[PDB]
Write a protein that binds this ligand. Structure first.
Ligand code: GTP
Ligand code: GTP
Ligand code: GDP
Ligand code: GDP
Ligand code: MG
Ligand code: MG
Lengths: 435, 429, 435, 429
């Protein structure tokens, strides 16, 4: 009776959703066709139920290119989703923000909002929104900005959580990533309650070093992000000794209206062969979470300060050990919070252990911990994007596409001003107080 | 959805198209009769993008074959993989362009361009959501150059929103298969830089060099060169004709590769290229493909990239591979060749990955580099044009069809302006 | 013992009747030959019974062209109908009102009335009339006008319900539709108790979007309208927790003598594959009924006000849910009734679920709802017809046929005046009251 | 019921009728002997509309074959599908009209018109409920023009209520098969606009063009042209000779297509028209038929519709199809060609749908357009007439049979008035 819908925009969102809903259907013992042969209700929060034993997800898969959605319709998860939700456009934004926010997406935004409204009104205790969207793709940035503005107009005060794919510092598949990123950030900065920074480069690094797989496909990154999402929602979806709802997330991890970009982290991530040879202490996994090499965003936390942290544990966990481990973490100097926030933790414990997906890469563990940490190091990352933007704007490169697709240069200048203001705010907060 | 219309102008365009449709039909498992005998449904899940499902469960290519002499047309018609083109498509004249551009754009072309546009319009209305046009033509031959430029201008008049692709066979630097090819090249380039979104420059010299050295073939017949260009085109379109972990469309390439309206000339490249014997003695890994694609000895345009900088680069892979591997390779290749890329475009490698190999391999790759080196090409041609214009040699043939000198003056000035722009952006800071 | 006869005029009426009587024979377990191998009596209201187990319908199929009636006589439903009723003319009105009301139909109107009188006198608790007739066809308009005038002369005060096929705004199979429509409306405006607006264009739209059939035949539209009719009569023909008779219809949905043109609507309409993935809440189906895209007349209800509504539910329905759903509907602003009618609903519940015809297109549902709604938006539609008429009368086009077939121009002018008066009345009612 | 009587005047009328009855008999499964050997009862459910069931279970066409020279009559009689006409019907004279209208309407025709009317009356009394008359004749040949006009006038005297159809082969604009055809055309048109309900103008030029280009036939014999006209007529009548989801009759077409008493000249059209080879390479869908039927290159009357506006349009389909598809196509075609239709007739497309294909095919369609373009035709003829009247050339042949100049003066004035009316309504607002 605490419902929460999922909205997947763009190819990244759709594939991540494939992984996430595979994970869920595995968790609650749900067959791909919605049937099912500590649990409570549990699945009601994400699965609505029809008359028969068939459950359907509360997901809205929207895209402008029918390729990936068609793959979904043809995949093993064909019987599952409500066929009306799988909204497909005709011509994708083609990595162009203007197309994804002014020209094309403007013609199916209404249908998407209609399906959203139907799903919302069929629910009673709606908690909030989960937008799964990338940052570089045109559909992702543009359509997500449009959709967030529309929802914020419609649903005045409700939780709105995003899982952006922050553009990596050195590996970029697109060429216009700075433009899409800056525009979508300038838009979503006033509507998204709490984003969730994740990058592909860091996940490549983690897969190579920790899991000992040298050649990972997007399937593996998707599985990892799905595990993170499942750990986020395990509080709603299960009985825990200290539960937490998404409103608690936005209250705890967001000190100021604008600074709401916490980065994700998960532990333990160890291969099946290395599953033994370590007992996986909860203090050990806490240390793993705080290890700068385990974060899922290519930013060294040591260059900034953790303004807030939220650690969600699951499995056979005992609160005293968590208290001891967090005390130890607070003792060390290399992990230096801001002076003005003396209490830098929210703790949540769940009774259900993480479940390993068959054919997966990780090993069956009894304890797991997902850290959502809002720090100041991420600020430097913005600088990089800013820098890129400046160069690609100093020559007015690629500007003609956006200009001719329903946008003006003054908008680019304004978004640059907004990003500069955000960087200024991060720097100002990073300093210490007097007296 | 996103159906693409294929136009073939000039003799070279038509032969390339014949080989191209052979390749595509081989991809989708299409019998020469035009009926599907394939085995994988994914072939038909997007079969509509290039084919139309005619009744009684047959397939006809969305081709529009244009020429001014029935010779090569009839050659295509008689040969196998010709019996499936829709016979009403074969538009041809009787006078023949006579290797003249004035005939191909003013006098003779003005009589068939109307019928061509009408069949174009019929095919456009037949499609559900038109994606764009791909024109396969030459730059030397009169028919190709003139009629293709005329068709492009007219289509851009009637469809200013669709996307435009051209595979123009640029004249080679060393040899000259024709005598007046500087004039045709200059006029065609004038029209193209007017009204085209992207232009895939190709030289026969580079294809000769590749078939000789890399493939170890001493007997390269035109079938093989056309086969290579067809493989390149198939690689370009497979990003939308097939599912992929990171899919691409023609509009994506246009947005990524064309920073400015005019500078939209790309040199292609393909990999792997292994001789018949030297194949089992090499490993087919993503690093191998990536390192193969970046060198003058595998660019299908006769100009060393090292003489300039890559403004942008796109790379479309095929077959099952690991994304992290591709990312690592692109990072390394962007690192070590830092002087080979433009400073003010960070992260200038567009990447796309399909899921199906080019039929008979494990994994392939197609490179589309928009560089500044190509300015040399234009430089060369420009100079040649200037020489042949200083004496006004061969001028009377073009003057006699209504065109005058001021046309040539304006076209040469325009090409020099384009070269100036390329030079300016090459040394920008 | 509450009998109600059916009169089918014109080809549209005859085919719709084919569908309707197929539906009935399926409902009561009646073989095509009138034999039969919660029910009560039930079928007595529409089926009269002879000595053997053979039942016959109380239908009078009248036409001026023997083609379609001959198809009926040759169809699988040959043994059913009483052969004397299948009245056939010789030369159809050929989409000419004058032929259908002055010249040709004048020569079989007497035989039709005679059969009507026989069928009426064989009944005891006659409720009223169901005229199934189109609006564009010559036979439909002319013959129906003549027949309605005759019946109103004969049967002074009895229910007279029509199912007109309102001419679509953009798809017109005929060319003289405005003339037939205006004439038949000017005539029937003083005799028909309650018409029932339905259009082909809206049903095309519904079949394409909801049922997901892109190429529908007239069979499908006929099946849908037959379902609507069956939902209308299920109260008479079955035991329900809150029944309603046709006199209640004319009392509730007709505020003024002239404004009696309610449009139909039905729900749920979902394909067999989409039958799952939704539990079909009665509140959900109520919302579907009020959705502007589900109405069966190409008129946006938002441009007018619902002067009255009548929702007839059937199947496993519970009154409390109906009350809650209607309360919610009354709460919303986009559904704005007139100020002077604060009670804008009649509710009826039946115990029998709708039955799906084998070889049909819809899916077996447990709850169904037919809405008959009298609004003000329909007024604009008249304007369109009026407009058309004006143009086709400004040049006196096609006038010679009607003039030479027993009619005068002054009649056209008078009918135009009458239509203008009706539009004026609709506009006047649409306004609000003072004090 | 609704039996139709067939009249055939002039040599062209008789040949067209021979092919027409061949087509009809093929439709209903009728052996050449006149006995039914068909397989579907629906053939016989309305077999009476054109046939009469003669005793011993045979069928005879309701034909009335008229001529003034026994040549073509005997040709019909000897050839197959001639042995089933009722032999008493073959009315013919000996003098022959001599390609003169004065002979065909005043002198020679006055001697046979009585016998023709008598056989007409016998057939009319034989029928249960007469539907109407269809006359198949020319406009150039003397017999056709003169005798057909005389028969039409007499019949309209004796049956002012029935409906009248004419398939008049209008003279072609470019060629002229006769020399005095302007005179015959003017006089015949005078009589027709006097006393006809509808007139299906046809030119041999358009049929030549269709058989040449669209059908890809270089050897069009008159058999083929007559076959096309026969298919058109069969398509017109199948709306009542057969069941249909939305049936039509001749009176329906007359009411829908004739806004004013005089302006009742229709140009027909047929679809699909596919060559022998180019058939399997095209899809047979309702959009394809609809788009085929609207273009000058498929109108059986030699006049571009674009020069004027369609006053009204009727469209009769066949074979199993979906009504919604037809409605959508008509909506689109009425939308995009908005300038091609008259403003003050909203929703000007009459639609009818049958249930039986015209044999061999999946679905066909017949177009009947009442447009303003045809005024050009009359314009042309009028001018020609004027010229040949200014010198009074050939006048003596017509004067010698009792006719005088004032006849020609009145007829030309009447035709000019008709053209003025067409012009007035074309630019009405
Ligand atoms: N983590 C993860 N990221 C992905 C995956 N697939 C694609 N991406 C991201 O998607 C980005 C490409 O832009 P997209 O957002 O996918 O563009 P799109 O969703 O196709 O929408 P368009 O821009 O209109 O084409 C890349 O930067 C990738 O990081 C995936 O499977 N896992
Ligand atoms: N809903 C529906 N409408 C139909 C069907 N068949 C015909 N119609 C309607 O019938 C109209 C044509 O005029 P009709 O009323 O049928 O004319 P008729 O009944 O043949 O009588 P005449 O006018 O004398 O020929 C069209 O506008 C159609 O909307 C059908 O099967 N279902
Ligand atoms: N790659 C390739 N190029 C060709 C082929 N045939 C001709 N060409 C090129 O096409 C040009 C001749 O143009 P062509 O179409 O034959 O003359 P046109 O009739 O005036 O258009 C020459 O410059 C050739 O380099 C071929 O098979 N492959
Ligand atoms: N379509 C068609 N037209 C014909 C045919 N034969 C003759 N005609 C036309 O008929 C006209 C000649 O009329 P005809 O009947 O032979 O002369 P008549 O004896 O005086 O009536 C010419 O203008 C021809 O165009 C035919 O087989 N098909
Ligand atoms: Mg995309
Ligand atoms: Mg009728």
């Amino acid at each position: 009776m605490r419902e929460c819908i999922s909205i997947h925009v763009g190819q990244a969102g759709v594939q991540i959703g494939n992984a996430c809903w595979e994970l869920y259907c595995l968790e609650h013992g749900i067959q791909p066709d919605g049937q099912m042969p500590h649990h409570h209700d549990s699945f009601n929060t994400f699965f609505s139920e029809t008359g028969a034993g068939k459950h359907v997800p509360r997901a809205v898969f929207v895209d402008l290119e029918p390729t990936v959605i068609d793959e979904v319709r043809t995949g093993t998860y064909r019987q599952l989703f409500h066929p009306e939700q799988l909204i497909t456009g005709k011509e994708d934004a083609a990595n162009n923000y203007a197309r994804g926010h002014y020209t094309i997406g403007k013609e199916i935004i209404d249908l998407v909002l209609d399906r959203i409204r139907k799903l919302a009104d069929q629910c009673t205790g709606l908690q909030g929104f989960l937008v799964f969207h990338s940052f570089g793709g045109g559909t992702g940035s543009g359509f997500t900005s449009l959709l967030m503005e529309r929802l914020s107009v419609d649903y005045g005060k409700k939780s709105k959580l995003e899982f952006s794919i922050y553009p990596a510092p050195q590996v970029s598949t697109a060429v216009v990533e700075p433009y899409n990123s800056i525009l979508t950030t300038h838009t979503t900065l006033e509507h998204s309650d709490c984003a969730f920074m994740v990058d592909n480069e860091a996940i490549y690094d983690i897969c190579r070093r920790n899991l000992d797989i040298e050649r990972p496909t997007y399937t593996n990154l998707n599985r990892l992000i799905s595990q993170i999402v499942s750990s986020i929602t395990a509080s709603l979806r299960f009985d825990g000794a200290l539960n937490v709802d998404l409103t608690e997330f936005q209250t705890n991890l967001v000190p100021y209206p604008r600074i709401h970009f916490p980065l994700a982290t998960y532990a333990p991530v160890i291969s099946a062969e290395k599953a033994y040879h370590e007992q996986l202490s909860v203090a050990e996994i806490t240390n793993a979470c705080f290890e700068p090499a385990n974060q899922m965003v290519k930013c060294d936390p040591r260059h900034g300060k953790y303004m807030a942290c939220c650690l969600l544990y699951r499995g056979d966990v005992v609160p005293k050990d968590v208290n001891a481990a967090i005390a130890t973490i607070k003792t060390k100097r290399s992990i230096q919070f801001v002076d003005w926030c003396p209490t830098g933790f929210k703790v949540g414990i769940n009774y259900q252990p993480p479940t390993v997906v068959p054919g997966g890469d990780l090993a069956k563990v009894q304890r797991a911990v997902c850290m959502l940490s809002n720090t100041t190091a991420i600020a430097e990352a913005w600088a990089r994007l800013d820098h890129k933007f400046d160069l690609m704007y100093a020559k007015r490169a690629f500007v003609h596409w956006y200009v001719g697709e329903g946008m003006e240069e003054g908008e680019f200048s304004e978004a640059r001003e907004d990003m500069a203001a955000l960087e200024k705010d991060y720097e100002e907060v990073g300093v210490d107080s007097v007296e | 959805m996103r159906e693409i219309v294929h136009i073939q102008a000039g003799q070279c365009g038509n032969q390339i198209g014949a080989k191209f449709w052979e390749v595509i039909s081989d991809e989708h498992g299409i019998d020469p009769s035009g009926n599907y005998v394939g085995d994988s449904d994914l072939q038909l899940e997007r079969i509509s993008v290039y084919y139309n499902e005619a009744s009684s469960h047959k397939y006809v290519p969305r081709a529009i074959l244009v020429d001014l002499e029935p010779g090569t047309m009839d050659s295509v018609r008689s040969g196998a993989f010709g019996h499936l083109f829709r016979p009403d498509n074969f538009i041809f004249g009787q006078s023949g362009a006579g290797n003249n551009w004035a005939k191909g754009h003013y006098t003779e072309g003005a009589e068939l361009v109307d019928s061509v546009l009408d069949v174009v319009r019929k095919e456009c209305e037949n499609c559900d959501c038109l994606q764009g046009f791909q024109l396969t033509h030459s730059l030397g031959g009169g028919t190709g150059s003139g009629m293709g430029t005329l068709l492009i201008s007219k289509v851009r008049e009637e469809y200013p929103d669709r996307i435009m692709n051209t595979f123009s066979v640029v004249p080679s630097p060393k040899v000259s298969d024709t005598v007046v090819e500087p004039y045709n090249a200059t006029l065609s380039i004038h029209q193209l830089v007017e009204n085209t979104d992207e232009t895939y420059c190709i030289d026969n010299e580079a294809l000769y060099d590749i078939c000789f050295r890399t493939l170890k073939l001493a007997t390269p017949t035109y079938g093989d060169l056309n086969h290579l260009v067809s493989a390149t085109m198939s690689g370009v379109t497979t990003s939308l004709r097939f599912p992929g972990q990171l899919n691409a469309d023609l509009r994506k390439l246009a947005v990524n590769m064309v920073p400015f309206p005019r500078l939209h000339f790309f040199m292609p490249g393909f990999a792997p290229l292994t001789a018949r014997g030297s194949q089992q003695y090499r490993a087919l890994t993503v690093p191998e493909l990536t390192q193969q694609m970046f060198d003058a000895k595998n660019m299908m345009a006769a100009c060393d990239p090292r003489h300039g900088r890559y403004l942008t680069v796109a790379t479309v892979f095929r077959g099952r591979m690991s994304m992290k591997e591709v990312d690592e390779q692109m990072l390394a290749i962007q690192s070590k060749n830092s002087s080979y890329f433009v400073e003010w475009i960070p992260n200038n490698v567009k990447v796309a990955v399909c899921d199906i190999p080019p039929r008979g391999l494990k994994m392939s790759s197609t490179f589309i580099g928009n560089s500044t080196a190509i300015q040399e090409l234009f430089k060369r041609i420009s100079e040649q044009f200037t020489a042949m214009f200083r004496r006004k040699a061969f001028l009377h043939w073009y003057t006699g069809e209504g065109m005058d000198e001021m046309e040539f003056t304006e076209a040469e000035s325009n090409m020099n302006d384009l070269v100036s722009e390329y030079q300016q952006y090459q040394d920008a800071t």
